[PDB]
Amino acid sequence: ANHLKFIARTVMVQEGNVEGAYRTLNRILTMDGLIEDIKRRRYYEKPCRRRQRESYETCRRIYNMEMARKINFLMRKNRADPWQGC
Amino acid sequence: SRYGPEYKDPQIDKEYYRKPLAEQTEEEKYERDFKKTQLIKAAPATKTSSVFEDPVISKFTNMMMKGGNKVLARSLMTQTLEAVKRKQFAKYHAASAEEQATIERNPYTIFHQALKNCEPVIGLVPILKGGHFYQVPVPLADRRRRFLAMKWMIAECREKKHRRVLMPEKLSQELLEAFHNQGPVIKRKHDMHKMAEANRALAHYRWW
Amino acid sequence: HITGLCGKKQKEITKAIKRAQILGFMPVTYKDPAYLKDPKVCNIKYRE
Amino acid sequence: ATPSLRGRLARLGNPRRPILKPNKPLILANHVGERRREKGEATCITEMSVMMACWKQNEFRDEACRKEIQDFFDCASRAEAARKMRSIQENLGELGSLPPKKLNKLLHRFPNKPHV
Amino acid sequence: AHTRYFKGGLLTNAPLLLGPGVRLPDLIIFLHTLNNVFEPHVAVRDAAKMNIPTV
Amino acid sequence: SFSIYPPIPGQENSLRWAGKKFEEIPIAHIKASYNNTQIQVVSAAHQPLAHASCGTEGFRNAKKGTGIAAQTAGIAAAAKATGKGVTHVRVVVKGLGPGRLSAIKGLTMGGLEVISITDNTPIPHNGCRPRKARRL
RNA sequence: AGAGUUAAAUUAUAACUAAGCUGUAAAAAGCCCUAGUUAAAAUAAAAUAACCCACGAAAGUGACUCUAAUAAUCCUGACACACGAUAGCUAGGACCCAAACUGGGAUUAGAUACCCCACUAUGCCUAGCCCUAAACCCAAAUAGUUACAUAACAAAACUAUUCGCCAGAGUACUACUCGCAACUGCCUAAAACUCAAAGGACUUGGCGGUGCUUCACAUCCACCUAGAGGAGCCUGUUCUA
Numbered sequence: 001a002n003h004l005k006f007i008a009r010t011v012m013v014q015e016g017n018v019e020g021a022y023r024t025l026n027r028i029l030t031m032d033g034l035i036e037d038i039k040r041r042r043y044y045e046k047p048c049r050r051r052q053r054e055s056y057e058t059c060r061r062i063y064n065m066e067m068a069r070k071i072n073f074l075m076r077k078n079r080a081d082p083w084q085g086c
Numbered sequence: 087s088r089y090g091p092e093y094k095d096p097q098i099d100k101e102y103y104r105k106p107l108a109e110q111t112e113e114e115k116y117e118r119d120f121k122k123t124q125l126i127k128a129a130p131a132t133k134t135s136s137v138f139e140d141p142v143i144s145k146f147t148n149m150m151m152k153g154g155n156k157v158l159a160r161s162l163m164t165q166t167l168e169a170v171k172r173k174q175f176a177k178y179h180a181a182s183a184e185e186q187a188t189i190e191r192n193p194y195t196i197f198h199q200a201l202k203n204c205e206p207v208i209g210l211v212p213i214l215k216g217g218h219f220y221q222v223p224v225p226l227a228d229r230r231r232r233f234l235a236m237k238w239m240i241a242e243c244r245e246k247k248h249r250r251v252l253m254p255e256k257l258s259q260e261l262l263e264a265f266h267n268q269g270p271v272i273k274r275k276h277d278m279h280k281m282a283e284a285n286r287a288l289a290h291y292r293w294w
Numbered sequence: 295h296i297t298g299l300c301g302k303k304q305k306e307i308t309k310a311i312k313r314a315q316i317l318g319f320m321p322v323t324y325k326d327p328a329y330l331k332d333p334k335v336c337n338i339k340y341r342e
Numbered sequence: 343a344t345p346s347l348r349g350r351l352a353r354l355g356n357p358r359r360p361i362l363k364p365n366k367p368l369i370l371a372n373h374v375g376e377r378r379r380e381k382g383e384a385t386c387i388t389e390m391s392v393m394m395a396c397w398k399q400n401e402f403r404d405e406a407c408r409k410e411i412q413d414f415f416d417c418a419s420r421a422e423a424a425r426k427m428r429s430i431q432e433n434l435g436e437l438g439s440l441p442p443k444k445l446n447k448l449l450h451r452f453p454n455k456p457h458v
Numbered sequence: 459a460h461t462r463y464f465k466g467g468l469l470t471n472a473p474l475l476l477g478p479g480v481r482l483p484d485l486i487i488f489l490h491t492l493n494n495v496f497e498p499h500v501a502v503r504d505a506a507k508m509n510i511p512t513v
Numbered sequence: 514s515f516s517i518y519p520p521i522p523g524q525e526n527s528l529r530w531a532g533k534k535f536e537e538i539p540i541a542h543i544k545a546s547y548n549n550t551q552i553q554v555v556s557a558a559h560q561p562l563a564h565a566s567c568g569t570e571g572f573r574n575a576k577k578g579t580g581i582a583a584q585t586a587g588i589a590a591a592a593k594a595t596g597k598g599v600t601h602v603r604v605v606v607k608g609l610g611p612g613r614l615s616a617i618k619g620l621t622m623g624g625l626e627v628i629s630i631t632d633n634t635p636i637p638h639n640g641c642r643p644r645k646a647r648r649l
Numbered sequence: 650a651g652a653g654u655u656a657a658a659u660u661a662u663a664a665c666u667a668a669g670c671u672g673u674a675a676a677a678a679g680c681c682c683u684a685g686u687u688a689a690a691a692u693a694a695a696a697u698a699a700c701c702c703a704c705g706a707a708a709g710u711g712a713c714u715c716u717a718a719u720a721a722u723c724c725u726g727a728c729a730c731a732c733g734a735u736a737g738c739u740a741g742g743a744c745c746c747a748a749a750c751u752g753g754g755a756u757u758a759g760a761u762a763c764c765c766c767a768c769u770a771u772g773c774c775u776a777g778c779c780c781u782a783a784a785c786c787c788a789a790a791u792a793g794u795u796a797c798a799u800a801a802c803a804a805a806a807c808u809a810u811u812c813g814c815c816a817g818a819g820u821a822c823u824a825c826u827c828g829c830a831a832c833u834g835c836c837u838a839a840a841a842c843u844c845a846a847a848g849g850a851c852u853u854g855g856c857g858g859u860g861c862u863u864c865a866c867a868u869c870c871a872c873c874u875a876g877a878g879g880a881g882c883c884u885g886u887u888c889u890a
């Protein structure tokens with residue numbers, strides 16, 4: 001409120017398409033986890049209930065990165081096989 | 087369903103077969119049709135290649151049938167097409183030349199124009215949410231609405247005529263009043279549209 | 295995962311951002327316009 | 343980059359105190375999570391309320407506006423075509439990834455070893 | 459040579475799998491100690507159980 | 514390098530819609546709450562030229578939350594603003610709710626022009642304690 | 650532990666504008682000294698950084714700056730000595746927000762609740778208490794080793810020196826005692842009686858108003874047709890006879 005207005009979280013339409021613009025916007029606010037925090041600060045969460053969420057989210061991201069990792073490392077052998085019906 | 091899935095439907099139209107030589111993808115299509123050894127259904131007895139059959143007339147006829155009588159319905163439809171025709175003659179010969187250019191004496195195009203005009207655009211479906219049934223605006227496919235119009239016509243004229251009043255007369259009346267939009271059929275259509283508007287917000291209840 | 299700095303340098307960057315903000319060197323709610331066109335270090339692609 | 347698994351969990355060697363409390367053991371499971379089927383929206387709503395406007399102004403004479411109606415039925419036809427096409431679309435997957443089956447044979451080719 | 463999917467009870471249960479009575483390989487030879495899921499191949503364990511030497 | 518979105522308060526840039534600088538273009542304040550949406554188009558000098566709500570639109574307690582009613586307040590707002598002679602609008606959306614996208618398309622649909630979209634959403638850096646979550 | 654500081658938000662309270670605003674699955678109640686926008690201190694709380702893993706003995710500690718400052722040439726150790734989250738008590742301030750309680754509104758057979766609206770003690774500061782937590786990482790401290798080894802699961806298995814603790818289940822975070830700024834408290838802690846079990850893990854089912862996928866083809870919803878339940882009568886039960 002004490003900062004200069006319209007410099008914060010602003011995107012201006014180009015070539016008159018509003019929809020696509022709002023899309024870029026939401027993509028941003030989501031990139032920074034602002035949407036999350038808004039839906040999250042709609043209500044409270046006690047600190048316990050918060051650390052649970054934290055750990056869960058972290059374990060989940062670890063498993064994710066690992067999974068994606070074994071997937072993409074194995075991506076090479078998904079081609080049509082050489083030795084079939086030996 | 088004495089047929090397996092193997093049996094394809096009969097194409098009853100004479101004009102498609104009589105004139106094959108100017109169409110490539112269609113020559114290819116009915117060639118792939120009869121070359122495959124396709125078992126083809128016995129054509130229905132109700133449908134004929136006659137130049138005088140309208141499947142619209144066919145389905146309104148059928149929908150009017152009760153019990154096992156195709157005869158009684160074919161007759162009531164004959165008498166309705168007749169009442170509309172001759173009544174349009176009675177309106178034509180009592181009129182002035184301008185209106186002798188205007189008036190429609192064809193009961194067929196008057197029928198198609200009586201159903202095209204009586205057809206409600208959107209229609210409601212109940213949805214259960216939080217324990218309540220809300221009626222929600224639904225975009226409808228052509229055939230369902232066709233059915234809607236026909237059914238409304240039959241239902242109304244079965245229902246609201248007095249006991250001395252014959253069926254084909256009453257149906258001629260409502261056909262003609264539906265041509266000009268002023269009969270109770272389009273009133274039911276309009277109540278359908280009013281109830282379609284009052285609740286339009288709930289259309290966000292629609293998931294499909 | 296974006297900046298890609300060691301622990302030390304990230305923490306110093308952060309302490310620095312806060313210290314530049316409350317003393318009044320740098321604005322909190324946005325990047326200063328002047329610096330929007332600077333060189334781009336980070337791996338964020340906003341526009342696709 | 344993968345979040346460090348060092349020193350996080352609670353074990354008998356650990357000098358520190360627990361960071362992560364795993365619900366289930368962290369092991370790459372042989373299978374992969376199946377495709378999550380997406381939900382539906384309310385389609386065609388725009389032409390719907392456009393035509394609602396059209397009727398509340400015209401005293402509910404359909405004859406007054408031919409255009410709103412036709413665009414509404416063209417939209418309904420676009421939605422039906424969209425539903426049939428989204429039904430036969432099962433070849434979709436993630437488009438640049440593989441459908442879950444092929445992933446699963448792929449992984450049952452190279453499992454992760456808890457044992458031995 | 460058996461180079462193929464190894465039916466589980468081959469050596470363990472010969473008489474039902476192979477025939478009413480049968481004589482068994484006196485010597486097994488492995489060109490790999492693995493099967494395509496990178497476990498010890500069954501026939502290691504099986505031969506070992508069946509009193510057969512292995513090279 | 515064309516249409517970089519954030520036009521600066523410094524005068525380095527000349528871009529004019531209806532001849533006016535970005536700074537002279539009347540704002541549209543759209544509040545989208547879980548229960549409502551209300552649009553107010555105001556001068557650059559902050560004198561209100563239009564106000565339209567979902568509840569001032571003819572809806573009621575439930576359905577007024579819906580997106581239909583958001584584009585609906587959008588149109589009548591854009592018309593009452595149009596009547597006082599505003600061509601363009603730079604938009605600011607307060608709140609994340611059912612009526613955001615609906616009212617933002619709903620303005621352009623009621624014959625008004627959109628140029629800028631910014632988000633002013635209250636974002637506590639840890640100010641006030643929000644009310645308890647609901648199952649309890 | 651001090652001393653100072655405030656970024657986003659909120660609100661007093663003014664000025665324009667609009668008559669509605671708030672709220673749920675859905676509604677009422679409630680407020681219209683209301684809402685939007687523009688202005689603005691006080692109190693409170695500390696987005697992002699953090700996918701980090703530091704500090705403290707534990708409880709704890711993540712807005713900013715500075716001052717003070719993290720015991721021990723380092724094995725163990727009590728009922729002694731100093732600490733100890735929340736809530737609670739006493740006195741003096743604070744009060745944007747949240748909120749037990751209570752009062753309305755719905756939900757319901759009832760609803761002392763879940764859902765909404767207010768609003769208080771109470772969270773906040775200073776001094777003094779109270780000394781309890783699933784105070785749990787249910788894994789004692791200090792040296793070690795990966796040798797022997799799988800009850801079961803889970804955080805793989807062990808030596809050595811210790812200190813604390815455990816003799817069926819209830820009865821029992823109980824009755825009596827002692828001590829304590831407590832006097833519905835804390836600590837320490839039985840027995841008569843009753844039972845033949847109480848318990849840890851596990852297995853197969855069955856079930857789940859759990860999540861996910863795919864279906865129902867006269868079949869659940871949507872949709873089609875003709876009926877039943879009303880009438881007379883036929884016939885079968887059930888009561889009375």
Ligand SMILES: [Mg+2]
Nearest residue numbers: 001002687688
């Ligand atoms: Mg302000």
Ligand SMILES: [Mg+2]
Nearest residue numbers: 001002656657
């Ligand atoms: Mg401030």
Ligand SMILES: [Mg+2]
Nearest residue numbers: 033036057699
């Ligand atoms: Mg985060």
Ligand SMILES: [Mg+2]
Nearest residue numbers: 357358359705
């Ligand atoms: Mg430590």
Ligand SMILES: [Mg+2]
Nearest residue numbers: 363364365366
């Ligand atoms: Mg667990």
Ligand SMILES: [Mg+2]
Nearest residue numbers: 638639695696
């Ligand atoms: Mg925080």
Ligand SMILES: [Mg+2]
Nearest residue numbers: 046049648649
């Ligand atoms: Mg509870």
Ligand SMILES: [Mg+2]
Nearest residue numbers: 650651774775
């Ligand atoms: Mg102090």
Ligand SMILES: [Mg+2]
Nearest residue numbers: 659660661662
């Ligand atoms: Mg205010």
Ligand SMILES: [Mg+2]
Nearest residue numbers: 547548578673
């Ligand atoms: Mg709601």
Ligand SMILES: [Mg+2]
Nearest residue numbers: 677678679680
């Ligand atoms: Mg009221």
Ligand SMILES: [Mg+2]
Nearest residue numbers: 054697698699
């Ligand atoms: Mg965080």
Ligand SMILES: [Mg+2]
Nearest residue numbers: 359360361702
């Ligand atoms: Mg930590």
Ligand SMILES: [Mg+2]
Nearest residue numbers: 716717718719
């Ligand atoms: Mg010092």
Ligand SMILES: [Mg+2]
Nearest residue numbers: 719720721723
């Ligand atoms: Mg030390």
Ligand SMILES: [Mg+2]
Nearest residue numbers: 706723790791
């Ligand atoms: Mg020590």
